[PDB]
Ligand binder design. Structure first.
Ligand code: EIC
Ligand code: EIC
Ligand code: NAG
Ligand code: NAG
Ligand code: NAG
Ligand code: NAG
Ligand code: NAG
Ligand code: NAG
Ligand code: NAG
Ligand code: NAG
Ligand code: NAG
Ligand code: NAG
Ligand code: NAG
Ligand code: NAG
Ligand code: NAG
Ligand code: NAG
Ligand code: NAG
Ligand code: NAG
Lengths: 1010, 424, 191, 49
C-alpha cells in the first residue's frame, strides 16, 4: 500500500552532451525519499504535475494508459495501448472497468493518430506537448540509480487531470513530481551516475553550495528559516453595478476632436467581456499595465475621453506624436497610463452627399499642452497685419470641416476613438473588476490580494490611524507594511513570515552522515525548527538539536560560539564548554625565592609567507574570445583594461621586491667550511647537500615535498580533448597566464647557504661589515653572557649542551613527516578557477555564448545582448583585481615581518621577549621553503628549580651590604650569594658586595658575617 | 613596439619590458556543412490549400525532410502580416530548424492583432493562445476572394463563451451548453443558456475589418538538437587541422577541427564544457564527431632599451620551445630559457648585475650595439679562515653617515558627484 | 514593533550578527591569570616555569634595569609605594574610549545604510517587486526585475569590499597589541 | 518572490563569493582574540594573602 523510493527517477534534462562535470539544474523531479503507492494484481488516480510510473512484471501484464479529465464522450482523451503500439486522441466513451480489446464503446472525431524486467516511465504535459521518458533494467521496489532517456513528445494539445492503467500477477508504483533543484554528476563517458536533491536536508544544501559530494569537518551557514504560505486571500470592495459600457461605446452621436468629451467613471465593476459579441476594435493599446492583468486590478481616478477623427490620423493618438491633431487638437502626456481604443464607424457618421457635422482646428499660434481644450472662434492672423474680423489673403477661420461620404477610401473614413485614463495601486479605488472576495485570515502566513496589490505574509490587527484619503502605508525601505481592509475598514499590519539563521555541524562525510543543527534565533528553553529530537541543548548562541551535552571540558574541536565546541566520539556528537588550560598556583611569600639548577636546550620552528603568484590578463580574449564584432563593440570601454593591467603589474613587481628584501641581505657569498669541527656541534642536517641535482639540505628537501604546487605549456601539448580536463590551459585559452619568479629556487638556497656559513663561522660580525672569524665555542660563551649567565657555565657543560642540541635538531627532522604556505597556493588557484567558471552566466541576455547570439540575430538586435555580456564580464574582472590587491597587501605585511626577523634574530641576538622563539634566544638558522621561509630558533630554558630563603640585604656591623650581582640565599644554615638564572653559590665577601647604607632603614635586613 | 606605443598612448617608451597581446592566428578559409536533402518544402500544400479550418478547431501539421527556400513564394503570394520572434528575418537563409509545425486557420480582419504572445480578447482567450516564450513566425493575408459568398458564407465558427481562459496551444472542440445564470441547464436554452459556438457571416461587400483573413503560425527550435529542415545553403569539403571558419547546421564559429573519441547518444548533436561553449560536434553527413579548439594561444613580451636610445627590441614568447613556428618572426639568434624563447638578443657567458629582469634568473641590457642576455650574479665569492684557536680583532674604525627616506602623507581630494556625472 | 527596532529590520532582510567564540568572562579570566603571574613571579612565567620572588626584590631588579642602583629603592620603599597607590587612584578617578566606540559606530552605520539602499529604483519603474509583478506580465516584468537585481548585487559587493579593508586595519592593530602584551607585560622593555 | 528567485540563478556564482569573503573575516576575528589574550595556557590563582 505504501513503499519508499530512495533515489529513483531521473532523466536527462537536455539533449546536450557533457562529461567529467557536475551540473546543477531545475526541473520537475520526483523528490528524494518520498512515499509511493503500491498496487497489486485499475483505479482512477489524479495527474497533478506529472507522474512517475514503474512496473515489476514477468508476463507482460501492464498494457497501456488512458489520460483525460472526464473519461466520457464530452471531452477529448489520450489512449496509449499495446496489443501494435496504438496512440489516439478522440472523444472516447470509456467503461468503468476497462481491460484488454473491450477498452471503449465509441470513438468520435479524432485529431491525432499513430497506429505504428523493471520498466520506468515519466510523463509530462507542457505547452500542448505530452513528453515521455523511459528506461528498462533487468533485476519491493529495488534500489539503485538509473537515468531515464527521452522517448517521445506528442502534440496533443488537451487538458489532463486524471489517468488510469490498462491491465490484461504484477505490481506498479505511482509518484508525483514537484519543481526542485538537483545537482547531477556526469562521468567520463557522459552517463549520469549520481545526484543530490538540494531541498532535502541542511547537509544537502551544504553539498549543493560547495558543489561537491563530500564535506569536510566543520560548521556551515545555510539558508535562513523559510515558511510556506498556507492559503490565498482576496479582498475587494462590495460593488454590484456594471460599468456603463453601452453609454460610452454605444452612444448615438460622438463629439468633435477640437471639443472632445470627457466623463468620469466610478462605483462599478469593469467586466469588459460583455463587449465581445457586439464590438470589434481595430485599435486597442495600453501603456502603464499589461492587458492580461486588467481582470485582477482596481483603478482609482477613471476618465473616458471620446471623439471622432479620420482613418489615418488614428496613429497620432500616442504619447510622443507630431501632426495636426497632436499639435492643435488633442495631446497625451509622456507619462500617460491608460488605454486607447479605436474602431471604424463608416456606417453611422457617413451620409450621402457629405456629412459636415465634425470639425477640427487647422491653424493655431502655438502647440497645446497635454489634456488642454481650445474652443475659440477668433480669426487667425498669418501675415503680421491687422485682422479685425475681415478675411482674405492674411486671415483664415481656424476651424475646418470633415466631409464624410460613404464611398471614400479607408484612409478618409470616420473612426470613433475612446481614451481611458486611470491610476493604479496608490489611493482608494472604486472601479474594481470581476474578482470574488474571500474571508479574512489573520495570524497565518497567507497569500493576499488587497485591491490588486498581491503579496505574502502574516496579517495582524494594528493601531495606526490612517487619514481618510490614505489606503496604504510604507516603511523606510519603501515596502508596504500597513493596509486598510476595503470592506470592514479596519487596518492591518503585514509582517514577513521568513526569519532566523541556521547552521549545520558535520564531522565529515568520509567519517559519518549524521549532523547537528543550530537554530540561532530560537529559545528551546520552540516550533520554528525543521525537526525536533530526543536531545535538545539550549546555548546562548541558539538551540542545538542532534548533539548530546556533557559536563567535562576539553579543548576546542569545532567552534560553535559563546564558549561551546563540539566533536565526534555508539558514536555521537557531543557539546561541551571549552577549557582555558591547567589549574595552577604559586607559593608566594615575602622571604622565599626559587632558583633553577639545570637547563634544557630547545629548537622550535616558525613559518612565514613571502610571496604569491603573479598573473596577467588579456581582456579582449576573456571578454570577446575571437569575435571581431565584439572586439569592435568593446572599444567604447577602452579605458578599463589598461587600468586593470597597471594594477596587476604593480603586484607582480612587488612580489620580486619582497623576495629581494627578505633574502638578498648579504652581497658576499661565503663558501661552506672545508673542515666541519665546531666544538662537537653537528650541522650536517641543515648544511647544503652537494650529492643532489640541487644544493638543498636535507631539511629543505623534506620541506619542498610537503607543499604541492614555472613551466612551458605548448599549444600542441593540450591540443584537442586534453584541454577539457587540464584545468590549466582551460585558464589560458581564455587569456589568463602565470609569470615566473625572477629568482629561482636554487638561487634562494644559495643565499641561505651563504647566510648559514656566515653565522656559523663569524658570529654576528658579518652583519655589520667585515666578517671576523671566532671559534664556535667562544661564540656560544658570548651568547651565554648575553642572557645573563657566566661563560664558565658553558665551558663546564660543553658535552651536555652539544648533545642536547643534536638531539633537538634530530627531533625536528623526525617530526617532518605548513598549511600557512599551502593556503596561499589554494587561494590563488581557486580565484582563477572561479574566474573561468563565471563565463557561463547570462547577465540578463538570452544566452551566454556570443556565437549563438550572432548566428540568429542581426547587428541592431545583437548589440543589445552583447553589451549586457560585456558589462557582466568587465564586472567579473574588476572584482578579481580588487581581491588580488587586498591579498597582496597582506602578503607584504608578512614579508616585512620576515625581513625584520631575519635581520634581528639571525644576524644578531635579540632581547625582545617572545620575538625569536620561547625562552632566552641564543641564535637562529633560516631555511628556504616554497613561497616562504622557515626559522629554527635555539633558546635557553631553565629547569629543576629549588627553594631558598632570601633577604634584600645583610648587616655586618651596623652597615648595609648589597649583593651587587645576584641574590643572597640560604640553604637553612649558611648564607651564600648566587646569580639569578643558575645556582652557583659563593662566599659573601667584600668583592662581591658593596656598602651604601647605615642598616637602619632597609625593611627585611638580616645580619650575618662577611 | 607599435602595440606598446598605442597602449601607453605615447610616441616614446621608457626602458623595460612590456606585456603585449596574446599570440593571434587568422582563419584561412571557410566551411559549410549541412545535411543532404533534395526535396522542397510543401509551400503549396500549406499556403495554397483549397479550404482552411476554423479558429476553434485550428489545424496543425508537421514539417520535416525538406529545404526551406521561400523565394518561390514571391511570384504569387503577398502577405499583409509577417512577424518573427526568436530570430531575425535576415538570418533565416543560413539556419536549420529542429521541430517545425505549421498551424492554420481563418479569422476576421481586425482580430489579426490578437495573434501575439501577450494579447487579450475573444480569440486569445477562448480560441487560440501563444506562449510568452514563443519562437517562430506569424503570417497573415486577406482572402476575400475565396471565403466570401453572395448572401453570406456561414462555414467558419468561433467560440464566444467559456468558463476559463485557454492554456497555450490548447484546443477545445466541445459543444456543451453554457450556463450563465447559475441554474440547471440540462439542454434547454433561453435566458440563462447559450450555444457556445457562433458563426462568421462573410459577404464580399463588407468593411475590410469584417473580411476573412487566412493565418499560418510556424513554430520551431534553433541550435540545440538534430535538424532536418535546412535553408538553401551549399555545403563544402571538410577541412581538419587548420584554423577555419565553420558553419555546422547553422552554428557558426572559428577554430581547429580534430578527430574525437566521444560517443554521443543518438539524440545528441553538440557538446559543451563547464564554460558553456561548444567543444564537440557531429558531422551531419559522415556522422563522425569532431573536437573544436581555439587557435589563439600564448603570451608575448617586448624588451626595449628606450626609444630615445634605439629602435631595436627583443621579443619573448612565453609558451614556445625553440630548443618553433608559433612566432611572429625568426632571426639569426634565438635563445631558449625556462621563461620562454627570446628572439633578437645575443647570449653571453659572463654574469653581471640585473638591468632588465626577464625571469627565471635572466636579465638583459644594451651593449655594433646590441641587446645581450645573461644570468644575474648574486655577488662576490668570499671565504672565512676558520680554525679552533684563531680570532680576528679590529684595530681601527670608520664613521659613516647613511640616508633613509620614508613617505608620510599623500594628497587629499574631494568630489562633487552631481558635477562629474550630470554636468549642469 | 518591527517598524522601529532597527535590528530586526536588518534581519527581516537577511542580515545577521554572529556571536564571539570567547565570552567576556573567559577574557577576564585570562587577564586575571596574567596579572597573578606577573605580580607573583616577575617575568619568569613568560619563559617557562614560574619562579616566586618577593615583590620588593622584583622592583629592585626593575630599578637595576633602568640604570639605578637597587639601594635607592630599598631606602625609598614607602615613598614609592605611596606614589604608585596615589597614581592608580588618579587613574580610576579620571574614568568618569572613543577609539573603541568608533568601530561599533562604523559597523552599525554600514549595516543600516545597506538596509536603507533598498528603496532605490536603479532605473526601473518602481523599487517594489510586488508592485511590478501586480501590473506587468512575465516578459515585460523581466526587464525591470533584472535592473533591480543588478543594483542590489552591486550594493552588496560594495559592502563586502569595505568590510575587507576595515578587517585588514583591525588585524594590524591586533598584531600591535599582541606584541605589546608580549614585550611590555611579560618583560621589561628598552625601546 | 519565486519569480525573482528563479531569475537570480543566472547570477549564481556571485553569492558564494561574498559569503566566502565574509567567512574569512569571521574566522580572522577569533584568531585575533586568541593571539592577543591566550598567551599563557596556565591559569594562576589570585594570591590568598
Ligand atoms: C510550409 C512550412 C515551411 C516552413 C519551413 C521552416 C522554417 C522557415 C522559417 C521561416 C521562413 C518563412 C517562410 C514564409 C515566407 C516568408 C515571407 C517571404 O516569402 O519572404
Ligand atoms: C466606460 C467603462 C470604462 C472601463 C472601466 C475602467 C477601466 C478598465 C480598463 C481596461 C478594461 C477595459 C478596456 C476596454 C475593453 C477592451 C478589451 C477587449 O474587450 O478586447
Ligand atoms: C465532432 O463530432 C461532433 C458529432 O458529430 C460534431 O457535432 C462536431 O462538429 C465535430 N467537431 C469536429 C471539430 O470535428
Ligand atoms: C569511458 O571512457 C574511457 C576512456 O575515457 C574508456 O576506457 C571506458 O571504456 C569508457 N566506458 C565505456 C565505454 O563504458
Ligand atoms: C448597441 O445598441 C444596439 C441596439 O440596442 C444593440 O443591438 C447593440 O448590441 C449595442 N452594442 C453595444 C456595444 O452596446
Ligand atoms: C496660455 O495663455 C498665454 C497668454 O494668454 C499664451 O501666451 C500661451 O501660449 C497659452 N498657452 C498655450 C499652450 O497656448
Ligand atoms: C461591505 O460589506 C461589509 C459587511 O460584510 C460592510 O461592513 C462594509 O461596509 C461593506 N463595504 C464598505 C465599503 O463599507
Ligand atoms: C530563554 O527562555 C528562558 C525561559 O523563559 C529564559 O529564562 C531565558 O532568559 C531565555 N533566553 C535564553 C538565552 O535562554
Ligand atoms: C641536568 O640535566 C641533564 C639531562 O639533560 C642531566 O644529565 C644532568 O645530570 C642534570 N644535572 C644535574 C645537576 O642534575
Ligand atoms: C651528524 O648527523 C648525521 C646524521 O645522522 C650523522 O650521520 C653524522 O655522523 C653526525 N656527525 C658526526 C660527526 O657523527
Ligand atoms: C617550594 O615550596 C613550595 C611550597 O612551600 C612547593 O610547592 C614547591 O614545590 C617547592 N619547590 C620545589 C622546586 O619543589
Ligand atoms: C647547607 O650548606 C652547609 C654549608 O655548605 C652544609 O654544611 C649543609 O650540609 C647544607 N645543607 C643542605 C641541606 O644542603
Ligand atoms: C642581629 O640584629 C639583632 C637586632 O638588633 C640583634 O639583636 C642581634 O644581636 C644581631 N646579631 C648579631 C650577630 O650581631
Ligand atoms: C496556387 O495554385 C494556383 C493554381 O494551381 C497557381 O496559379 C498559384 O500560383 C498557386 N499559388 C501558390 C503555389 O502560392
Ligand atoms: C482543465 O480541466 C479542469 C477539470 O476538468 C478544469 O477545472 C480546468 O479549467 C481545465 N483547464 C482549462 C484551461 O480550461
Ligand atoms: C550525405 O552523403 C554522404 C556521402 O557523401 C553519406 O555518407 C551520408 O550518409 C549522407 N547523409 C546522411 C545524413 O547520411
Ligand atoms: C624544450 O625542448 C627540449 C627538446 O626536447 C627539451 O629537452 C626541453 O625539456 C623542453 N623544455 C625546455 C624548458 O627546454
Ligand atoms: C686609523 O685610520 C685613520 C684614517 O681614518 C688613520 O689616520 C690612522 O692612522 C689609523 N690608525 C692606525 C693605528 O693606523
Amino acid at each position: 500500500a505504501y513503499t519508499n523510493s530512495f533515489t529513483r527517477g531521473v532523466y536527462y534534462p537536455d539533449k546536450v552532451f557533457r562529461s567529467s562535470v557536475l551540473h546543477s539544474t531545475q526541473d520537475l523531479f520526483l523528490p528524494f525519499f518520498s512515499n509511493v503507492t503500491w498496487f497489486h494484481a485499475n483505479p482512477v488516480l489524479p495527474f497533478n504535475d506529472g507522474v512517475y510510473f514503474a512496473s515489476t512484471e514477468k508476463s507482460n501484464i501492464i498494457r497501456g494508459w488512458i489520460f483525460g479529465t472526464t473519461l466520457d464522450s464530452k471531452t477529448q482523451s489520450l489512449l496509449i495501448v499495446n496489443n501494435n503500439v496504438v496512440i489516439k486522441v478522440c472523444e472516447f466513451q470509456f467503461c468503468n472497468d476497462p481491460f484488454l480489446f473491450r477498452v471503449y464503446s465509441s470513438a468520435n472525431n479524432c485529431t491525432f493518430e499513430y497506429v505504428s524486467n523493471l520498466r520506468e516511465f515519466v510523463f509530462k504535459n507542457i505547452d500542448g506537448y505530452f513528453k515521455i521518458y523511459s528506461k528498462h533494467t533487468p533485476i519491493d521496489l529495488p534500489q539503485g540509480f538509473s537515468a531515464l532517456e527521452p522517448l517521445v513528445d506528442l502534440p496533443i494539445g488537451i487538458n489532463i487531470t486524471r489517468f488510469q492503467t490498462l491491465l490484461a500477477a504484477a505490481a506498479y508504483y505511482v509518484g508525483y513530481l514537484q519543481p526542485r533543484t538537483f545537482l547531477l554528476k556526469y562521468n567520463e563517458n557522459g552517463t549520469i551516475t549520481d545526484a543530490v536533491d538540494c531541498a532535502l536536508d541542511p547537509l544537502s544544501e551544504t553539498k549543493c553550495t560547495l558543489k561537491s559530494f563530500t564535506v569536510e569537518k566543520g560548521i556551515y551557514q545555510t539558508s535562513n528559516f523559510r515558511v510556506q504560505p498556507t492559503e490565498s486571500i482576496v479582498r475587494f470592495p462590495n460593488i454590484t453595478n456594471l460599468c456603463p459600457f453601452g453609454e460610452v461605446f454605444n452612444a448615438t452621436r460622438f463629439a468633435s476632436v477640437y471639443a472632445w468629451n470627457r466623463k468620469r467613471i466610478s462605483n462599478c465593476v469593469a467586466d469588459y467581456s460583455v463587449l465581445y459579441n457586439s464590438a470589434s476594435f481595430s485599435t486597442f493599446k495600453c501603456y502603464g499595465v499589461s492587458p492580461t492583468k486588467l481582470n485582477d486590478l482596481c483603478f482609482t481616478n477613471v476618465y473616458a475621453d471620446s471623439f471622432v477623427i479620420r482613418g489615418d490620423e488614428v496613429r497620432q493618438i500616442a504619447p510622443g506624436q507630431t501632426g495636426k491633431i497632436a499639435d492643435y487638437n488633442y495631446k497625451l502626456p509622456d507619462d500617460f497610463t491608460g488605454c486607447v481604443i479605436a474602431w471604424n464607424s463608416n456606417n453611422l457618421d457617413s451620409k450621402v452627399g457629405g456629412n459636415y457635422n465634425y470639425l477640427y482646428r487647422l491653424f493655431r499660434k502655438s502647440n497645446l499642452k497635454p489634456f488642454e481644450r481650445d474652443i475659440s472662434t477668433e480669426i487667425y492672423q498669418a501675415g503680421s497685419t491687422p485682422c479685425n474680423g475681415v478675411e482674405g489673403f492674411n486671415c483664415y477661420f481656424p476651424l475646418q470641416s470633415y466631409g464624410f461620404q460613404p464611398t471614400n477610401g479607408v484612409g478618409y473614413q470616420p473612426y470613433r476613438v475612446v481614451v481611458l485614463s486611470f491610476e493604479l495601486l496608490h489611493a482608494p479605488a472604486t472601479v474594481c473588476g470581476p474578482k470574488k472576495s474571500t474571508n479574512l485570515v489573520k495570524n497565518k502566513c497567507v497569500n493576499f490580494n488587497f485591491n490588486g496589490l498581491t503579496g505574502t505574509g502574516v496579517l495582524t490587527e494594528s493601531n495606526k490611524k490612517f487619514l481618510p484619503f490614505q489606503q496604504f502605508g510604507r516603511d523606510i525601505a519603501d515596502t508596504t507594511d500597513a493596509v486598510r481592509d476595503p470592506q470592514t475598514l479596519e487596518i492591518l499590519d503585514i509582517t514577513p513570515c521568513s526569519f532566523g539563521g541556521v547552521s549545520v555541524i558535520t564531522p565529515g562525510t568520509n567519517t559519518s552522515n549524521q549532523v547537528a543543527v543550530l537554530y540561532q534565533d530560537v529559545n528551546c528553553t520552540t516550533w520554528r525548527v525543521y525537526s525536533t529530537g530526543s536531545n535538545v541543548f539550549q546555548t546562548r548562541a541558539g538551540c542545538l538539536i542532534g548533539a548530546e551535552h556533557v559536563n567535562n571540558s576539553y579543548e576546542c574541536d569545532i567552534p560553535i560560539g559563546a564558549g561551546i565546541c563540539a566533536s565526534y566520539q555508539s558514536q555521537s556528537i557531543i557539546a561541551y564548554t571549552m577549557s582555558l588550560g591547567a589549574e595552577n598556583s604559586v607559593a608566594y611569600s615575602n622571604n622565599s625565592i626559587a632558583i633553577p639548577t639545570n637547563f634544557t636546550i630547545s629548537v622550535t620552528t616558525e613559518i612565514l609567507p613571502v610571496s604569491m603568484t603573479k598573473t596577467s590578463v588579456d581582456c579582449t580574449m576573456y571578454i570577446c574570445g575571437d569575435s571581431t564584432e565584439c572586439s569592435n563593440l568593446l572599444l567604447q570601454y577602452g579605458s578599463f583594461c589598461t587600468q586593470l593591467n597597471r594594477a596587476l603589474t604593480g603586484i607582480a613587481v612587488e612580489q620580486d621586491k619582497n623576495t629581494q628584501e627578505v633574502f638578498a641581505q648579504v652581497k658576499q657569498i661565503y663558501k661552506t667550511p672545508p673542515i666541519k669541527d665546531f666544538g662537537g656541534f653537528n650541522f650536517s642536517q641543515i648544511l647544503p647537500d652537494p650529492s643532489k641535482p640541487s644544493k638543498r639540505s636535507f631539511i629543505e628537501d623534506l620541506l619542498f615535498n610537503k607543499v604541492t604546487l614555472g613551466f612551458i605549456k605548448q599549444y600542441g601539448d593540450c591540443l584537442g580533448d586534453i584541454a577539457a580536463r587540464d584545468l590549466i590551459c582551460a585558464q589560458k585559452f581564455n587569456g589568463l597566464t602565470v609569470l615566473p619568479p625572477l629568482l629561482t629556487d636554487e638561487m634562494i638556497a644559495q643565499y641561505t647557504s651563504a647566510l648559514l656559513a656566515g653565522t656559523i663561522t663569524s658570529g654576528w660580525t658579518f652583519g655589520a661589515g667585515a666578517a671576523l672569524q671566532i671559534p664556535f665555542a667562544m661564540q656560544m660563551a658570548y651568547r651565554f653572557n648575553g642572557i645573563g649567565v657566566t661563560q664558565n657555565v658553558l665551558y663546564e657543560n660543553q658535552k651536555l649542551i652539544a648533545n642536547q642540541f643534536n638531539s633537538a635538531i634530530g627531533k625536528i627532522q623526525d617530526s617532518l613527516s605548513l598549511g600557512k604556505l599551502q593556503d596561499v597556493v589554494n587561494q590563488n588557484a581557486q580565484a582563477l578557477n572561479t574566474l573561468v567558471k563565471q563565463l557561463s552566466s547570462n547577465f540578463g541576455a538570452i544566452s551566454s555564448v556570443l556565437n549563438d547570439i550572432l548566428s540568429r540575430l542581426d547587428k541592431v538586435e545583437a548589440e543589445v545582448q552583447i553589451d549586457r555580456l560585456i558589462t557582466g564580464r568587465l564586472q567579473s574582472l574588476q572584482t578579481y583585481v580588487t581581491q588580488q590587491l587586498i591579498r597582496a597587501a597582506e602578503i607584504r605585511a608578512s614579508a616585512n615581518l620576515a625581513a625584520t626577523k631575519m635581520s634581528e634574530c639571525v644576524l644578531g641576538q635579540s632581547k625582545r621577549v617572545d620575538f625569536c622563539g620561547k625562552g632566552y634566544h641564543l641564535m637562529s638558522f633560516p631555511q628556504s621553503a616554497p613561497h616562504g621561509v622557515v626559522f629554527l630558533h635555539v633558546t635557553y630554558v631553565p629547569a629543576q628549580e629549588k627553594n631558598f630563603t632570601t633577604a634584600p640585604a645583610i648587616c655586618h656591623d651596623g652597615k648595609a651590604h648589597f649583593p651587587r650581582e645576584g641574590v643572597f640565599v640560604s640553604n637553612g644554615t649558611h648564607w651564600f650569594v648566587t646569580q639569578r638564572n643558575f645556582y652557583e653559590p659563593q662566599i659573601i665577601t667584600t668583592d662581591n658586595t658593596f656598602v651604601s647604607g647605615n642598616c637602619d632603614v632597609v625593611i627585611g635586613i638580616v645580619n650575618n658575617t662577611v
